[PDB]
Write a structure and sequence with these properties.
The chain is an alpha+beta fold. The protein contains eleven helices and 17 strands. Strand 3 and strand 4 form a beta hairpin. Bound molecules: the ligand CNC(=O)[C@H](CC(C)C)N[C@H]1CC[C@H](n2cc(-c3ccc(Oc4ccccc4)cc3)c3c(N)ncnc32)CC1. It catalyses: L-tyrosyl-[protein] + ATP = O-phospho-L-tyrosyl-[protein] + ADP + H(+).
Length: about 450
Amino acid sequence: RIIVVALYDYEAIHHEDLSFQKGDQMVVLEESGEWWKARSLATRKEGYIPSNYVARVDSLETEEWFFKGISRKDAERQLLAPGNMLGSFMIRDSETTKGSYSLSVRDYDPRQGDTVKHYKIRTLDNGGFYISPRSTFSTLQELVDHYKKGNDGLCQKLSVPCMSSKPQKPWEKDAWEIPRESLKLEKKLGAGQFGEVWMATYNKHTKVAVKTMKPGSMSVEAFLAEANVMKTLQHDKLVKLHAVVTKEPIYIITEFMAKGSLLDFLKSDEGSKQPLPKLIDFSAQIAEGMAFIEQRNYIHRDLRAANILVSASLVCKIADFGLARVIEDNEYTAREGAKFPIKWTAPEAINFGSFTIKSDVWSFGILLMEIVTYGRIPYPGMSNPEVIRALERGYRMPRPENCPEELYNIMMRCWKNRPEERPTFEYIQSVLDDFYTATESQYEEIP
Ligand SMILES: CNC(=O)[C@H](CC(C)C)N[C@H]1CC[C@H](n2cc(-c3ccc(Oc4ccccc4)cc3)c3c(N)ncnc32)CC1
């Protein structure tokens, strides 16, 4: 008997889904995938449930102020989102002390502006918790109630839990290769060289995006082989690949991203007004996604701002990872013109077809420049031959206005002519994640 309790409200969408009042209790039967088979004790109706809507009855996951499965950086982004107030907080699993916890608190001061401060919650050997030795607690709930009453050494008195929203429904069971009839294409979002993108509805209940590839552009078997790898590249900063239609014209079904391409967003009324530290955060998010791709020994091949998508909450997600590999070169695709962009591509990829994670690093440097110029064409005033010849002679784009020198230094590292001399995305991710807090302590040393 493994027992869980519902967190959010969820109703039937598929064959056998159940009732989810905000506080119903159930027993887990099976645990394969993100959909769990389970039986309820309330009115005892049965079927399948979304695992991310439930939580173990004795676990901290039931608490409003506990955020399971997020990082320190995630925590900071979430707390700094609009709608949160001074003293907004969360408790999360510690990233640097396994089994222990961390408290993250939204702070403000006129010098540093909006920040998030982090505290180590230590566990007592015989039970309980403390941040400072003079104030111990039997439960994390007692700790929270204590610091809601007064700061007692913290940067702020705790106010309310970090705002959150009901998570995405997990994708339907075993609906990887889906029938084309399951999709109603509702709005064409754009047309490109080798296909179109539509907003669509999947089986009357789920909003998705559908990339519709032109006949002649891809092979079903080649595409599917690659797509079966793509779908496993699951990370908060990569766009989620839900499903495919494995018949020409091949369809690629992904999560819908409300603010479209980062390139378009940077050139929009709203995006053109993002302050520099937000631009840096965008850059960090993309680098986190690319560090994942690097860790997974994968290659993007066409990294640039056009292929970054932006969510309604301004989360950046990498799209089209690996796709260029399975776009075919034939009479059909040739009729369009110009497969990959010279100004974004590493010289060894151009010259020899050597695409690697290091040519992606080169491209990332170009993307950084796209970001800090709000979407300007790379190498303004230069033709493609001019770019290639200048690069060969050690020319690189100069630092533009409103670009921190350290950011430009990262670009210059990305643009080493020898690929082995370019940094790892693991390195880039670390320097961008800590861009403004490099000389600052990890956690607050509270007395
Ligand atoms: C004037 N501006 C325009 O015309 C610009 C295009 C320019 C920025 C170049 N117009 C474009 C701007 C991006 C728009 N777009 C593309 C995708 C997408 C991307 C990749 C997908 O497939 C994948 C394949 C492999 C791995 C991951 C995903 C699926 C959907 C997408 C989405 N999921 N949600 C929302 N908008 C999306 C479409 C119209």
